[PDB]
Amino acid sequence: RDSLIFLVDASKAMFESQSEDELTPFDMSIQCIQSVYISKIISSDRDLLAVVFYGTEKDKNSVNFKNIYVLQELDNPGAKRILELDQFKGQQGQKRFQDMMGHGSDYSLSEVLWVCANLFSDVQFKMSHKRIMLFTNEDNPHGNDSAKASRARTKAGDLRDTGIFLDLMHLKKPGGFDISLFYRDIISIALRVHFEESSKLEDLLRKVRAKETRKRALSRLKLKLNKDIVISVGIYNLVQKALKPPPIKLYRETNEPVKTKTRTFNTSTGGLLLPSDTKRSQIYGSRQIILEKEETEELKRFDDPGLMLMGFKPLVLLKKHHYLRPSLFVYPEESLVIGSSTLFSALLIKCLEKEVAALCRYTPRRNIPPYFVALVPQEEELDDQKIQVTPPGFQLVFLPFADDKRKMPFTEKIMATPEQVGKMKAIVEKLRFTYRSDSFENPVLQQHFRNLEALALDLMEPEQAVDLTLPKVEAMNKRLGSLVDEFKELVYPPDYNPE
Amino acid sequence: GNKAAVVLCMDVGFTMSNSIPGIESPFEQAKKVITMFVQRQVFAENKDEIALVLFGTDGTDNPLSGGDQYQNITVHRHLMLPDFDLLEDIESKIQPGSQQADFLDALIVSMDVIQHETIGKKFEKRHIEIFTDLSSRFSKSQLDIIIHSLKKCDISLQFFLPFSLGDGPFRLGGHGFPLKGITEQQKEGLEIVKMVMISLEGEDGLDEIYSFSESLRKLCVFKKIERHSIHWPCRLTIGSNLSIRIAAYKSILQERVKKTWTVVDAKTLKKEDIQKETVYCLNDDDETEVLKEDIIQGFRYGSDIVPFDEEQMKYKSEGKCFSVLGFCKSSQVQRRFFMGNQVLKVFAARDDEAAAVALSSLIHALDDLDMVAIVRYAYDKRANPQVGVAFPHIKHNYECLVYVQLPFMEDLRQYMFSSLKNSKKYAPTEAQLNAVDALIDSMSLAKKDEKTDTLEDLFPTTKIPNPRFQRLFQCLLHRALHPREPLPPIQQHIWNMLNPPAEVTTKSQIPLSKIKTLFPLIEA
C-alpha cells in the first residue's frame, strides 16, 4: 500500500487570488485533491489518502496541538470523502471553510510534521511509500523566528530518516517562490532540479499525478547483445486501457465479499481432477489430436524470456501505420546487474546521434513465441513547467508479422486539383488546435462512475457528464462559415446523394 | 471469400535429387514448402480445395495420357478438400523419379484439372503453382494455348525456383544458388518463365517468381487467395454539412490461433465426462454456501460499495460515427500514445468518384500542411466511443487515412524516471563513443542500395509470418503422424527466418568483444 497526506496550508495566503480569473490557490488545492481522489477511485487503486490542514483555528487530530486540523485520517477514498472535499469548491466553498475553519493562525512545521508522523504511526498495513505532499506558497514560514525553523528542519530530517518522503508542491506566490530559502533541505532528494511554481489547476494536477504514482515494472527482463553481454532492464507500460472495473456480486443480505470457486470433478465419481489426469485435445474434421498439457505449453519455447538484440535498423524503415498493440517502455534496472545503466546510457546516446532504432526479438515470459520489437530511442523532455513529459529510455514498438498485416482492395487512385486542395487547406486551418496527450477523458467511465456515485449516496438522478469527445458542431460550423458550401459545390455534383 | 481451387504442380525429376552437401536438395525444399501450404490449409480449417499434381515420376496418371503424350504426369490427388492423407503423402510416399518432365505439359495438365473438375463447383479464385528447378527441355508450341486459356479460364499462377531473381552456408529460409551458378537450360527456362509471368501480370509478374528459401519466410504461397477484408461503411463528417461517405478496413489486426485446447479425460479421451463447477460460498472463513438468489450484482467504489432503471441506466451513444474533433500538427500526435489492438485504413467508398475526390483533397491538404485529424469513432450504436488520430497515407497506388485509437487521461500513467544524459555517476567516457558507435555501425540491417542513394533493409521483419503458427502446425501434424513419439525440435528454416543475416553477426563479432572487455558488468 501507499499512504499520502495532502498537508494543505490553510493560512490567509492560500485564500488570496492575485487579482485574476484563475482560482484562489486554496481552491486549486481542493479541486486538485478532489481530482486525485476521484482518480484513485477510477483505477481501483487501494492506496490511502489523508487530508490535513495547518494554520487554521480549530483542530481535530490525535494529540491536539494548535491549529492542525486532520480533516480525514488515513483511509481509503469513498463517496463521503469526495463530497466532503467538494463542499470547499468555489467561492462559497471558501466561505464555508472560513466558518468552521478560521484562517490565519500561527503554527510550527515541527509540530505539524510530528502530527503527520503520528498519523502514520497508528496504521499497521505494509505500505510501500509514505509521502507528505505539502502545499505552501510561503517561502519562509518561520522567517520571524529561527528556533521554529530549526525544529522544523530537524523534524523533516527525522521524517526522511524514517523512510517518509517529504514533497513540496509550492504554489504561485507573488514575486516568485525561491525554494532555496527554507525548503532547500526539507525535501527528500533521492541534483533533481525542482518543479516550477504551479500557476493554475492543470499544472498542479499533473505535477501531483506525477509525484504520487510510483513506477511499477510491468516486468523485468534481460536485454542481450550476445551469449554473454546481458543487461537487465524493466519494461514499464506507460499506457494501458483502464477498463470499467468489473462488478463484484455480493451476498444479498449483508453485502459481503463472496467466493467463486473452480471445482472441476468427474461426472461419475465426483473426485476432483488432478491436472495430471487430463490430456489436451483438438479436433480437425473427423480426426483428433491428443497431447499432454506440458506439450501444449512447450510447443512454444523459442527463447529464454527477454529481449535479445539483433540489429540496428535506421528509424526511417519503422513505419508509423505498422502498429500492432500498445507500445511499452524499456528502462535500465541497475539493481540486478551492476553497471547496466551505464551501457544503456551509451546505447541511447549513440542511437540518438545516428537516428537508429534497435530491432530485437522479445519474449515476455517462459513458453511464449516471440515478437519482433524495435527499441526506438527517445530522450527526456523537461517541459516549460519542468515536468518530464517524455521520459528517457527506449520506447519498445511491436512490429507485425505478415499474418497480421491485411491486404486491402483498391479502386483507381483519384486525386483532386490543387484548387480543391487549397480550399480544404483553408477548411483544415479553421479547425486547428493543440492536441495534448492528456486532453480528453472517457465518456463511459465518467458517466458510469457518476452513475455509481449517485447510487453511492441515494441521489435522485446522477451527474451526467458533459461530453468532450463529441464534435462541438454548432460552434465549429459557425467557425467555418461558408467555406463548407464552397467545398461542397466544388466537389459534389448538384444532385449528389450523400445519404 | 467462399473458396479457392489451388493446384500444386511439383517437379520431382532426377535433377531435383541434386543434394549438394550443405544445401537442401530442391526436392526436399519443395516438400517443405508444400507442407507449409497444406498444413496451414488444413489446420486453419480453410475451405480451399487443393489438388496435387506430381511430374517427374516414372509412371503416368492423368486424362491426357492418350497419344503417348504427357509422360511423367501423375495426378497424385484430384480436387478435393485437403486432409491428413495428403500430409502423410507429402513426406512418406512421395519420392523422386529418374525422368525429367516438360513442366509446360504440367501446366496444361493442371489447366485441364481446374477447368474440368471445377464445373459443378462455384469458386471465386483459381490459382496454380509450380515448384521446378527448370532442368528439362520442352516445346513452346502449346504455350500459345496456355495463356490463350489462362486469362480466359481466369487462372493465376506463381513460380518457385531454387534460385532467386536477384553464397556461403545456405541457410534454408534464411536472410541472405548464384544466378551465374546455374546452367544454360535453366536460363532458357527462366526466360520462358519471365515471359509468361509478364504476359499475365505486366511488370508485377517478376514479384511472383520466388525462391524456395524466400518462400519459407513469406506468406507468398497464400498470397493470391487470402480472404478479402470486410468493408465497414461510415461517414466522416466535419461540421454537419461536410459529410464524406467512406469505407474503412482493418489493416494490422493481430493474428491468434482459432482453436482452444479442449480438456478431456486422460483415459477415455472425451470432454463431456468433465464439467466445471463454480459455486458461491463465503470467501472469508466460515465458508458457507450462498445461493444464486442470495447473490446480487454490485460494484465497488474505493471503500464504499453499491448494489445493483438500474439495468436501463447504461450509457448511450449517438450511433456509428466517424466525425472529427480538430486537426493538429503531426509532431504532437506521437506514436507512443496509440491504443487499440488494431489499425484502420479509411478509403473513400467504392462507386463514389466525388467522395474519392473529397477524401483525396482532405488527405493531400493534411500531408502538405504536415498535420493529422483527431477524429471520434464508434463502431456501432452499441459501441464505446473512442478518439483516435486519422493521419494521411498516400501510396502511388491509393490514398487513405490511417486511423489509430489514442489514449484518454485515465489511460496514461505519467511516471517520473530519473535523467540519464544529465547523470553524473555514468560519466561520458570515450568508451561510450568509440565502442558503441563501432557496434552500431556493424549491426546495421540497412544498406544503401546499388544506387548509392536509396536505402534497402537487409532483414524486413514486418514480412516474416508468425513462427508460432508453423511451430504449432508442425507439432499437431507430427502427433497426427507419429502418435507414439515426442514433439520435434523447431525446424531450421524457422530458426533461420527469425535471425539476422549472418553478415550482421560476422561483422559484429569484434565490437561485441570490445564491449565485453570495456563495459564491466557484474551481477549481485
Author numbering:
A (entry chain A): 35 to 224, 229 to 537
B (entry chain B): 5 to 170, 180 to 189, 192 to 323, 327 to 542
Which text from the study accompanies this structure?
Nonhomologous end joining (NHEJ) is a DNA repair mechanism that religates double‐strand DNA breaks to maintain genomic integrity during the entire cell cycle. The Ku70/80 complex recognizes DNA breaks and serves as an essential hub for recruitment of NHEJ components. Here, we describe intramolecular interactions of the Ku70 C‐terminal domain, known as the SAP domain. Using single‐particle cryo‐electron microscopy, mass spectrometric analysis of intermolecular cross‐linking and molecular modelling simulations, we captured variable positions of the SAP domain depending on DNA binding.
The first position was localized at the DNA aperture in the Ku70/80 apo form but was not observed in the DNA‐bound state. The second position, which was observed in both apo and DNA‐bound states, was found below the DNA aperture, close to the helical arm of Ku70. The localization of the SAP domain in the DNA aperture suggests a function as a flexible entry gate for broken DNA.
